[PDB]
Design a protein around this ligand. Structure first.
Ligand code: ICS
Ligand code: ICS
Ligand code: CLF
Ligand code: CLF
Ligand SMILES: [Fe+3]
Ligand SMILES: [Fe+3]
Lengths: 467, 522, 522, 466
């Protein structure tokens, strides 16, 4: 499939739209040559809201704090357990990630405000959950619309109880997607948590302290990243929102380097720690052997000879392991074509792992990326591959019908559509209840999963022998 | 490390000594974790009656709820109509969540749009959103009907759906005749079930209200059946099956059976089956309208009685022996169709299963939860089986309902140790299963975390979960089951006795210790 | 001691201290038991490859067999005919046993008589027994037909069934025209499946061998269906349901489904439903005869082909996707009926469930057993699911069968690690699940003792049993399930995925240990 | 139900039969005959001599391997049918729930199985080293084909220093399970019981007893024993219920044999008396009244010490069984039971029912002899119904007229009467509940009769539109 074939496909698809939608969507579909706008109403965007980005993504994973889905019951219920941010803890005692704490707004709270209810709740949280190490209040749509002052309540109650209480104004009507949620969340960490130990000289820093910024530990992804950096002699003082603690966050200003995986969700805070604490940051990729190897090497290069050399040891150690996974899966997956649609990082970052298995990504796209994400993406995709920002359900269905990829990698709302069309589908958010996919150990699982689905005997059994 | 012939996923990869060490170091080094002995102390404390009293005094904090919000039900109601797009006017985050939540429970596509109201609509209203939204949806997804619902954003700013829809028709965004029924579905009033009721009532009003002048109650000779919020495909199919068996002309309003179970045959079908607009228009001409789940269909009842002039029968949800009997006899009455030999046999086969399984079921103690109708039917059935529904919890239940259920309980020796809880939640229930330990829970997937908590206290305190309800996300295809009718009663019985027997097999699987009672025959 | 409010049955009564003490004393004084350390040592020995090799060298000892004897199958065959009394000529012990065995599996009455041959008859034969027997049975239980089989006593002494029945007619004990088909059913030849085959063919012969002159292959435009030894009600049911929705005229020869499921309505019905004598007589006029379980219907085949002149289609048991497709298309061909839209969709739904559940089922390893047709169908379906049928045991399988299955395995990358065992028993299988541990067993209730053994070696060596087959004694109402067709495939698929997911939930229910992977959504 | 009424029922029911059968069945319906052949074709509930020997007497003996010698059916249908409970490591040192069989194929019928039995004895010895002995339970063909399982046992036994017991319990022998018991009693006597006749190593005490004929159904022997040892006695052996070979060999040293099941065990008891002077007595451990009566009778046989302790025990359980009657009796008062079981229980449970104020209006046995019926007429009420080797037809017809509130019989009867609307309890397997013996057994027995008879399901058999 060629250049003006992709261009004519785009026009073909856009023909169905009313003119306004047409003109807009046209700007959001491109063909590659090596964003951040509102969704058009009624077109079945796959996007979520600012609450998803703040509660679901950034704060939710923080293990030992209680997060309050503040507003009506919906938001917190549908997101409860929704995401696979893994963690070690005693849930309901010292850790709370999979629980749904909510202020469960009823009409009296809408009509007269929930700030009073929130103060009551904070006390209730305190009596019933004495081992919590902090609270966050994730505002749902009504909180801002209603004119509550969660900040006042947070300061007052925080003062009274000597707790870190973070107000987060991540109401779903703000921004255009879960992206602004990340930014609001980053700012809330900044304003209410990150400064707490500014005056603590007490932490015994070493020249090798790093923090994993933007790894939410999906299926243990952060754990299989950590092990590698640790083996290379670095100390990870903190994992940002993936099995994360509040103390780890408060300690993050002591480190020597911020290692950013998820640029999109956490570049904001990285920039800030740079300005304020002088801490430099760097982007890395831990999807597949190739990327993991160059990342380990770029990170090692930031330190002194001992680390450069532990790096080389680590790389040598895993060589036989990753080299075996390919010899076993490579022959089963080479030349297959993958279409991706994911959120703000993985649509670009998951290309190298595919290529290590001889696969090609013929189309990719993001829900909520900005243009700096697309600048990064174009480097990674082939000429004439399809790019789609905030794809509509319709557009996606149509692109798939033309391109006929062998495998699609996207979310839970896309899964069952393509499976019914007979295209092997892997969930590229929840790692389809499998994973981790990060690091060398994650590559083995990734390889095995792409293979089991794409080469599954079920895909031959769609059409009945009589039609 | 991985061994390429035995690749390990998260479990049990992280049990490998190197991972174990790394995690221990992470903790000790940076997490400032409470000491384990403190954690244990707090855990034991959270199992006490003292924790419980305090847990039960909560007024502002809800922890682990057993309900969701209005538009979720409105969407489910809407999918039940022929080639209809559910449309929720408000913020888009809601639609992503409604579609994902049902996607997880049914394993299928769940189609639904938003009109993406942002910051700006919060000030000036969402009129332009409705105008472009409707047009765009109609053009792109080609539904015969658009069923409009609302998110809390659009509720708080007080958008007049009716005006906006009329203005969209008036400005020519969508043609005048195009069906756009609507409902206001505020997340801060009642729950998901209310949204179903509101939506259905909106749709019934839309096709019927200004047409009543030619409707003769009875001339089509059918009974309307309104299922309510229903997440088991079987329940839909069992109803129609039974009515077809009786030769009873019916008109199930809101069928989402087809579209929640399309075949995997190389094509994705966005719409399938459903109640036709013609069925909804003709629905006043029916002999009567039966409400399968009357405790969340109050608004629909008022409308059907008040406007269609139907004497809606005083029927409980057709769950268990007695209530399936009442359902059948009422249908017989209304339609003049005799209850056929097949249903008589089927009922006696259920009764037969009862006789065979009674000794294992006798006196078993249950904690349970769900929506009000579902819960009362399960309560009823448990009593019929000689079991004890000891903790009955319905977060979204109301006072009158609670009264109805306490009455049901008072009418049986097996109700004596039972208490009904309304407005309470799964963290509340957690206390109750520690302090007044039942044998099993009957609930939805959220229950697993309770079972996990009980196990942590010790094996003797573990309360196993029996997954019946919504949502069920950690098992596959149970959404295909039936809980209504004699069929559903058969399934529930089988699932109860076998959960009991399997647990007993587990407890008696100790070589030379407990396997003296590990009987081949039970 | 007992608490009147909390009475303990055997489990856990005997765990009480005073019993624990009492049993300890009983042992140590009087039992002269081998010391526990030796017991443990022998137990570990029995799990080894060393033990396995000796175990597999057995020529004379059978331990825990996975078959029963001929007359059991004859009885089941016989119960499938209208108002027929099964009658086993020979000694009564057998009949008590046959009845009990089925009573336990079906939880239903099972009516069968004996002639009660004693020592006296061993010397002089069983003629008088047959004479008074038939007469007595006919008068007392008033069957329309008496279907005669044999026990090993009667076989060994060589009683001529034909002559004996003829002399009972001659001598006036039963009317000349009272239907008394027979079959010799030696327990020392083949197994229960063989007994069914012999009985069916006796009944087929009885009703057709003389009348053949007026028979026109095809004239009644039906297809005959012979089910074989079948102990799932859903299987008889699904075959009828599919053929009916396809509009195919058919004649289910020998159907027990009514008499094995008779409502508890205040009456005991000895007889219910079943294939009519008129259908057996009209059966040569069918277009053709389809054998649902061909590997134990050899004699029946020979007769249907040799005498009725039917070209019996070469179809496998309709288990799994491909074999259900092949079945429907062959039926379409013979009947001239198209496969209706409803069947086409049901198959689609089945494939849907496969696509949704494939990631959990992929590469899962199973040990399995049962009858030859059941086992191969289940092998077939496992392969289609992407699962590996590692240990395939069929005690009553033959060499040709083992070839057929090895060919099925050979055609799939999923069959690569699988071995079929014929003439082997469950104590052989117990070594195989130790030395080449699969994830699950699919088997009948005798499998529980293997699970108990694996558990005893350690939790990580436990192989859970998934109960599919016959007999299932330690769960209730599984006899009502389906294993044939798309329906049966859907059930098996759901039971497998869910057994996998229950097991993982057990393994990840450890607070702060394994729970990291105790996901809500799977 | 009056007596002229009962006799009228008896005659009416019999009128379906052909004359030969009618005249015989009349003889078997408070006199009565028992232990005769079953009439052909009439659906007897009886089993065979194999069931009596392997199923009942030998099978429970946990540390021996019991070979079901013949074709595959018998062993298979009897695998773990009976709830004879044992403590042990099954497959290593205990073997009760396993099915061992010589699985006869045609070659073994035509040429005999004696060489195959020799080969399998070797194989048993290889794969199950910790076994303490082997028994060989013959099925129908073994005698018919002229095999000599005795020579095989004697030869192989000598060759391996192992007790190998040949049992000629072929199903064609006798008329029921009954002869099986006797064949089995004689097989113990001839190949096991004398083994320690020259042994002076066992320290007997004046309080050694043995439980003879408690097969520990659901733990019944365990809940019996406890009471005897709480009374001061030492139970050296339990016969066939969690029973071990050494126990059986030690039984010659006891002071007294406590016979529970008279039918199955009287044979060996009488023999022990003749050969060893050990006296034997009958007792009943069903219900408080009987257990009380029994504990006392057995104690009065020894002295004072055992008699004080007997009275202690009685007081020690009086709170418990009285709580049970208080709870359960008002629920079961005046309810009428019809029974049908094997050779003991049809009389022995009568008192236990009466302790809950229930009336046994009918009882009968599969395979009892006249001595059992002598015993039975004392316990039964005036004008109640007795039936020996009842036919299916008869039992159904009796129940239709008598209309009992509860029926207590076996697995082949269970589902018939449940469909008729009559509460049914299995009084062989205790419906997978029990124990029913002793005071702890009484508690469960009481809970079980109530749960079933007063179950909500029995109200529901009739459809409301009918
Ligand atoms: S945070 Fe972001 S949508 Fe960077 S909101 Fe989303 S666990 Fe995606 S592409 Mo779900 S920007 Fe993480 C993401 Fe990427 S939830 Fe996960 S998979 S790497
Ligand atoms: S041995 Fe007898 S038939 Fe005495 S063969 Fe039978 S475990 Fe019965 S009435 Mo089943 S003479 Fe025991 C018996 Fe009674 S098996 Fe059990 S219940 S007390
Ligand atoms: S964007 Fe929660 S789901 Fe909504 S309707 Fe009122 S309760 Fe229900 Fe984002 S933040 Fe939440 S998810 Fe929406 S509400 Fe806004
Ligand atoms: S009375 Fe008794 S039970 Fe019968 S056989 Fe004889 S001992 Fe045995 Fe050959 S037919 Fe099958 S195998 Fe056995 S059950 Fe029969
Ligand atoms: Fe699906
Ligand atoms: Fe039954």
């Amino acid at each position: 499939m060629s250049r003006e074939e992709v261009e004519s496909l785009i026009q073909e698809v856009l023909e169905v739209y009313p003119e306004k939608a047409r003109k807009d969507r046209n700007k959001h579909l491109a063909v590659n040559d090596p964003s951040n706008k509102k969704s058009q109403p009624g077109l079945m965007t796959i996007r979520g809201c600012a609450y998803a980005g703040s509660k679901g993504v950034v704060w939710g994973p923080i293990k030992d704090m209680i997060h309050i889905s503040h507003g009506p019951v919906g938001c917190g219920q549908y997101s409860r357990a929704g995401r696979r941010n893994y963690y070690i803890g005693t849930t309901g005692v010292n850790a709370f990630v999979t629980m749904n704490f909510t202020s469960d707004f009823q009409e009296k709270d809408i009509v007269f405000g929930g700030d009073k209810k929130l103060a009551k709740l904070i006390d209730e949280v305190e009596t019933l959950f004495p081992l919590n190490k902090g609270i966050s209040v994730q505002s749902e749509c009504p909180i801002g619309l209603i004119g509550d002052d969660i900040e006042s309540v947070s300061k007052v109650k925080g003062a009274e109880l000597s707790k870190t209480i973070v107000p987060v104004r991540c109401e779903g009507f703000r921004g255009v997607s879960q992206s602004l949620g990340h930014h609001i969340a980053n700012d809330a960490v900044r304003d209410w948590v990150l400064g707490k130990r500014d005056e603590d000289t007490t932490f015994a820093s070493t020249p090798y302290d790093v923090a994993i910024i933007g790894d939410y530990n999906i299926g243990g992804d952060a754990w299989s990243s950590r092990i590698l950096l640790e083996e290379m002699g670095l100390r990870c003082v903190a994992q940002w929102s993936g099995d994360g603690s509040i103390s780890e966050i408060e300690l993050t200003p002591k480190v020597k380097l911020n290692l950013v995986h998820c640029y999109r969700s956490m570049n904001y805070i990285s920039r800030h720690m740079e300005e304020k604490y002088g801490i430099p940051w760097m982007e890395y990729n831990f999807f597949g052997p190739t990327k993991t190897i160059e990342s380990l090497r770029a990170i090692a290069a930031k330190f002194d000879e001992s680390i450069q050399k532990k790096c080389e040891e680590v790389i040598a150690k895993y060589k036989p392991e990753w080299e075996a996974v390919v010899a076993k899966y490579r022959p089963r997956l080479e030349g297959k074509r993958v279409m991706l649609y994911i959120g703000g990082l993985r649509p670009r970052h998951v290309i190298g792992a595919y290529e290590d298995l001889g696969m090609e990504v013929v189309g990719t796209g993001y829900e909520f990326a900005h243009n700096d994400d697309y600048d990064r993406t174009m480097k990674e995709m082939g000429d004439s591959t399809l790019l789609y920002d905030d794809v509509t359900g319709y557009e996606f269905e149509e692109f798939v019908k033309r391109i006929k990829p062998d495998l699609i990698g996207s979310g839970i709302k896309e899964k069952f559509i393509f499976q019914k069309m007979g295209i092997p589908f892997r969930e590229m958010h929840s790692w389809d209840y499998s994973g981790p996919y990060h690091g060398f150990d994650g590559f083995a699982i990734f390889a095995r999963d792409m293979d089991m689905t794409l080469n599954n005997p079920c895909w031959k059994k769609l059409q009945a022998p009589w039609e | 490390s991985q061994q390429v012939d035995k690749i390990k996923a998260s479990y049990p990869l992280f049990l490998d000594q190197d991972y174990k060490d790394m995690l221990a170091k992470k903790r000790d080094g940076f997490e400032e974790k409470y000491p384990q002995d403190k954690i244990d102390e707090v855990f034991q404390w959270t199992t006490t009656k003292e924790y419980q009293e305090l847990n039960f005094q909560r007024e502002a904090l809800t922890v682990n709820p057993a309900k969701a919000c209005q538009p979720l039900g409105a969407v489910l109601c809407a999918l039940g109509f022929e080639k209809t797009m559910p449309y929720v006017h408000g913020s888009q985050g809601c639609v992503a969540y409604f579609r994902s939540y049902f996607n997880r429970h049914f394993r299928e596509p769940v189609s639904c749009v938003s009109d993406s109201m942002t910051e700006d609509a919060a000030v000036f209203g969402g009129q332009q959103n409705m105008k472009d939204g409707l047009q765009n949806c109609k053009a792109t997804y080609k539904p015969d009907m658009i069923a409009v619902s609302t998110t809390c954003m659009a509720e708080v700013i007080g958008d007049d759906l009716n005006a906006f829809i009329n203005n969209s028709k008036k400005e020519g965004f969508i043609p005048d005749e195009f069906p756009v029924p609507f409902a206001h579905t505020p997340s801060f009033v009642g729950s998901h079930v209310t949204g179903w009721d509101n939506m259905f009532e909106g749709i019934a009003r839309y096709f019927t209200l200004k047409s009543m002048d030619d409707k003769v109650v009875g001339s089509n000779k059918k009974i309307n059946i309104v299922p309510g919020f229903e997440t088991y495909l079987g329940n839909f199919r069992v109803i129609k099956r039974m009515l077809s068996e009786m030769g009873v002309g019916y008109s199930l309003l809101s069928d989402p059976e087809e579209v929640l179970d399309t075949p995997a045959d190389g094509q994705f079908r966005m719409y399938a089956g459903g109640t036709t607009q013609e069925e909804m228009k003709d629905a006043p001409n029916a002999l009567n309208t039966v409400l399968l789940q009357p405790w969340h269909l109050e608004k629909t009842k008022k409308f059907v009685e008040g406007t269609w002039k139907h004497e809606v029968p005083k029927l409980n949800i057709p769950m268990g022996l007695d209530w399936t009997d009442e359902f059948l006899m009422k249908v017989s009455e209304i339609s003049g169709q005799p209850i056929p030999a097949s249903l008589t046999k089927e009922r006696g086969r259920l009764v037969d299963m009862m006789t065979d399984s009674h000794t294992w079921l006798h006196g078993k103690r249950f904690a349970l939860w769900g929506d009000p109708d579902f819960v009362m039917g399960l309560v009823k059935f448990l009593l019929e089986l000689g079991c004890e529904p000891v903790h009955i919890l319905c977060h979204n239940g109301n006072k009158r309902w609670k009264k109805a259920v306490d009455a049901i309980l008072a009418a049986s020796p097996y109700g004596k140790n039972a208490t009904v809880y309304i407005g309470k939640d799964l963290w509340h229930l957690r206390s109750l299963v520690f302090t007044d330990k039942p044998d099993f829970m009957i609930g939805n997937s959220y229950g697993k975390f309770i079972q996990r908590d009980t196990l942590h206290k010790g094996k003797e305190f573990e309360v196993p979960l029996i997954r019946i309800g919504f949502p069920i996300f950690d098992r596959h295809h149970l959404h295909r089951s039936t809980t209504l009718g004699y069929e559903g009663a058969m399934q529930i019985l089988t699932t109860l006795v076998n959960s009991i027997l399997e647990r007993l097999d587990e407890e008696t699987r100790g070589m030379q210790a407990t396997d003296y009672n590990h009987d081949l025959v039970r």
